């Protein structure tokens, strides 16, 4: 349009729901699991 304030949107499912492609979930969990919290002390193994 002309004035940018008119963009808005149609009916839009927000990014909050949507839902996973898998591997992107793997990405976000690893960053939440490994980082910001633990810096692993985990007793399982390297793998």
């Amino acid at each position: 349009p002309v004035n940018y304030q008119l963009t808005r949107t149609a009916n839009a499912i927000p990014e909050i729901f949507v839902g996973g492609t898998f591997a992107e979930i793997k990405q976000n969990l690893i960053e939440w699991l490994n980082g910001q919290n633990e810096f692993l002390d985990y007793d399982f193994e390297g793998s």
């Binding site: 349009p1 002309v2 004035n3 008119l6």
Partner: protein, 332 residues
């Protein structure tokens, strides 16, 4: 800073006189200005016109901005003094479509008697009242304080915390008190005849009479009875503190010679010029000041007179219906 210091303020009454000066300035003879409304600008600007927003070219007051205007002027109308009118903000008593229906500040003019939810007298009249006082309860204005009177000293604006039951019923000042019941002391000021209210008053503003139409009868305005220590106090335009004026004209009155152009392509910009000279064939002629009623802008000299106001607006195409209205409400 150590010096003599003086603290001075122009009174609001100065404005209403200035307003009263613009009126009476319309007349045929010299020293009486004559105002025109101009439309013009047939050709569209850009291509983004007809869209939403986008703004027009912002008009400038320079000589270049005037010259083109006179080239595009489609038509003009002469403002007669009759179609100009005084106006004031209207607060209809007990109307729910506007803030504080049942509450009122210390002095606020409020019309009643129009529409059923306020009744008071019959025989119409659209009665109006100044409201001289308020019940005292509720916290108001500056800081905290508490009580009304102390809040009335040290400036302050006190808002009553108690709804005022019933409209002002009487014909004379200070209609409150005089009974154990509540309410506060409204003060009648004039009346609006029903005939004028359907025409001259819109729902945003109520007319208040020029100190002329109050003559050739007062009675029509319900002012026929008044205290009047003075022989007259005739003009009440000062009593209300009327700060503003309002113009009205039907677009059938404006003159378009072409008559198919303004309809097909709209007038995109409106400007009002003062004191145009008539068409002069050559600079062989004496300067005459414009009179009669219409003036195809061909008959106006270019740059002939000075222009107080320019507007630029999207196309505002107009239908030929015998009712559409100009407004242009001045705040003087």
């Amino acid at each position: 800073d150590s010096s003599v210091i003086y603290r001075a303020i122009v009174t609001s009454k100065f404005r209403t006189e200035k307003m009263l000066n613009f009126y009476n300035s319309i007349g045929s003879g010299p020293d009486k200005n004559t105002i025109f409304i101009t439309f013009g600008r047939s050709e569209p600007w850009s291509s983004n016109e007809n869209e939403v927003g986008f703004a027009p070219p912002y008009p400038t007051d320079s000589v270049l901005g005037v010259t083109d205007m006179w080239t595009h002027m489609m038509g003009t109308v002469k403002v007669l003094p009759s179609m100009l009118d005084a106006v004031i903000p209207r607060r209809d008593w007990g109307d729910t479509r506007y803030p504080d229906p049942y509450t009122f500040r210390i002095n606020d003019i409020v019309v009643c008697n129009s529409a059923p939810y306020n009744a008071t007298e019959s025989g119409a009249g659209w009665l109006v009242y100044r409201c001289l006082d308020v019940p005292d309860t509720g916290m108001c204005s500056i800081a905290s304080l508490t009580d009304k009177d102390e809040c009335l000293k040290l400036g302050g604006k006190w808002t009553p915390s108690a709804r005022s039951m019933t409209p002002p019923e009487g014909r004379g000042d200070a209609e409150g008190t005089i009974e154990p019941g509540d309410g506060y002391v409204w003060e009648y000021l004039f009346e609006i005849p029903p005939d004028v209210s359907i025409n001259r008053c819109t729902n945003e503003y109520i007319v208040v009479p020029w100190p002329e139409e109050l003559k050739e009868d007062p009675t029509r305005w319900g002012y026929e009875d008044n205290l009047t220590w003075q022989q007259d106090d005739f003009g009440l335009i000062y009593r209300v503190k009327a700060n503003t004026i309002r113009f009205k004209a039907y677009l059938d009155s404006v003159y378009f010679p072409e008559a198919a152009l303004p309809g097909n392509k709209g007038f995109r910009q409106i400007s009002i010029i003062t004191n145009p000279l008539e068409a002069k064939a050559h600079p062989n002629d004496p300067n005459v000041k414009a009179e009669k009623d219409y003036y195809d802008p061909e008959d106006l000299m270019r740059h002939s007179g000075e222009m107080i106001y320019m507007e630029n607006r999207p196309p505002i195409i107009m239908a030929m219906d015998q009712t559409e209205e100009i407004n242009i409400l001045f705040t003087f």
